[PDB]
Write a structure and sequence with these properties.
This is part of a larger assembly, with 6 copies of chain A. Chain A is an all-beta fold and 57 residues long. Helices cover 0% and strands 21% of the residues of chain A. At the A-E interface, strand 1 and strand 4 of A face strand 3 of E. The complex binds a molecule of 2 linked components (NAG-NAG) and 2-acetamido-2-deoxy-beta-D-glucopyranose (NAG) (5 copies). One 2-acetamido-2-deoxy-beta-D-glucopyranose binds next to loops of chain E. Chain D: This is Spike protein S1.
Chain lengths: 57, 96, 49, 87, 42, 22
């Protein structure tokens, strides 16, 4: 199964406070509108990182 | 008729200036150019220019006078070239 | 625990023992004349403490 | 000690400023802060959950206002841009 | 990611919600393990 | 309609805006 990662997966790259300052950084991020898999078990690679989510009851 | 046309034109000026605020580009762009020159000048403070640390105090509090002198020399060269570039830009823009 | 160790390892099989939760008095390691050289590159020997 | 130009130091982070207790709404992991120009603007004191502001101790050029020495040797100084309860 | 920092988040929702949510870090692991694979328990 | 501590002082103009308007 596949699905589109609309806008998720952005993290504060470092621990320095900022405010209303549009900051441009370069690190590892999950590119927008990407192809995220969708499981409902198998073991997976870890190429450069992971954005793992979950929706459980 | 002349006075009417005059006063109507003044009113049109009022309306235009208050609605389509893109009329003051000539002044707003002088202000923006100065702001961007200053922002570049301040950004340049936080670049290594080939040194090990873009913080003069972190260089001072880590190295001996001999090696710190090489690092500080790189930083001074870089910052001085940046400041001279900014001042030349200002001289040209002020001539304009 | 890393300098007075009973033994080292193979140079191609070296071991790295990171350290934390310290007050690292580098003065004793500096004035300790046991070491053959003090070749620092990111710091100056009189600046660790 | 606050409200003075103080030669602060935290973990080696040094400098000088008017260390003033602040309200930088950190996330507990965050260490310090900045503004539009990427300037050190706080620090988490290694011995307290204190986040303080920073404003460098006021400098500013001096300017000497003088009638010509031809007229008199009296002058008047102009400390530029200082709330000069602080000279 | 890599070192092995583990950011996180948690929201209520109601098949991936189209929205935005930053990721405020939780844990740091200063180990250095070579990881090229992973899996999830259940 | 018209819209930091590194030795970057900004001197004030000699003719204030109200004197200009006068
Ligand atoms: C000359 O031009 C003026 C302005 O266009 C005319 O004056 C207007 O005429 C119209 C229609 O006749 C009136 O509704 C307006 O009230 C007049 N005044 C203004 C300020 O628009 C004028 O009729 C023209 N011809 C002449 C003067 O012979
Ligand atoms: C990537 O997403 C598209 C949908 O835009 C999908 O058709 C495609 O199968 C996905 N990639 C893979 C490898 O399945
Ligand atoms: C010791 O450090 C901890 C960590 O911030 C702090 O909460 C505590 O008040 C400190 N105590 C003393 C006596 O320094
Ligand atoms: C001041 O200048 C005038 C010329 O205007 C000269 O005659 C006079 O001697 C000068 N005096 C002093 C004290 O400089
Ligand atoms: C200087 O600062 C003090 C303290 O806030 C204030 O009371 C005073 O009015 C200030 N003076 C000027 C000229 O800003
Ligand atoms: C790390 O893991 C990969 C996974 O196959 C392996 O090929 C590699 O030899 C390991 N060590 C290093 C130093 O990359």
């Amino acid at each position: 199964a596949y699905t589109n990662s609309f806008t998720r997966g952005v993290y504060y790259p470092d621990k320095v406070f900022r405010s209303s300052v549009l900051h441009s950084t370069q690190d590892l991020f999950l590119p927008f509108f990407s192809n995220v898999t969708w499981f409902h078990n198998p073991v997976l690679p870890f190429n450069d990182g992971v954005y793992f989510a979950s929706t459980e009851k | 008729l002349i006075a009417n046309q005059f006063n109507s034109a003044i009113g049109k000026i009022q309306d235009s200036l208050s609605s389509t605020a893109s009329a003051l580009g000539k002044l707003q762009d002088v202000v923006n150019q100065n702001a961007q020159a200053l922002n570049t000048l301040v950004k340049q403070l936080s670049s290594n220019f080939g040194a090990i640390s873009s913080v003069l105090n972190d260089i001072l509090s880590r190295l001996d006078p001999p090696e710190a002198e090489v690092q500080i020399d790189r930083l001074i060269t870089g910052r001085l070239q940046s400041l001279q570039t900014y001042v030349t830009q200002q001289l040209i823009r002020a001539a304009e | 625990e890393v300098f007075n160790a009973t033994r080292f390892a193979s140079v191609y099989a070296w071991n790295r023992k990171r350290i934390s939760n310290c007050v690292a008095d580098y003065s004793v390691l500096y004035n300790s004349a046991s070491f053959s050289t003090f070749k620092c590159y990111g710091v100056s020997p009189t600046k660790l403490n | 000690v606050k409200n003075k130009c103080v030669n602060f130091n935290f973990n080696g982070l040094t400098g000088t400023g008017v260390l003033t207790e602040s309200n930088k709404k950190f996330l507990p992991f965050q260490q310090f802060g900045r503004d539009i120009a990427d300037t050190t603007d706080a620090v988490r004191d290694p011995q307290t959950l204190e986040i303080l502001d920073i404003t460098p101790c006021s400098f500013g050029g001096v300017s000497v206002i003088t009638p010509g020495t031809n007229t008199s040797n009296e002058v008047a100084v102009l400390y530029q841009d200082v709330n000069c309860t602080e000279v | 990611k890599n070192y092995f920092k583990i950011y996180s988040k948690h929201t209520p929702i109601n098949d991936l919600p189209q929205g935005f949510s930053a990721l405020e870090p939780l844990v740091d692991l200063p180990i250095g393990i070579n990881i090229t694979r992973f899996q999830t328990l259940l | 309609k018209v819209t930091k501590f590194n030795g970057l002082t900004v001197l004030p103009p000699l003719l204030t805006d109200e004197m200009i308007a006068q």
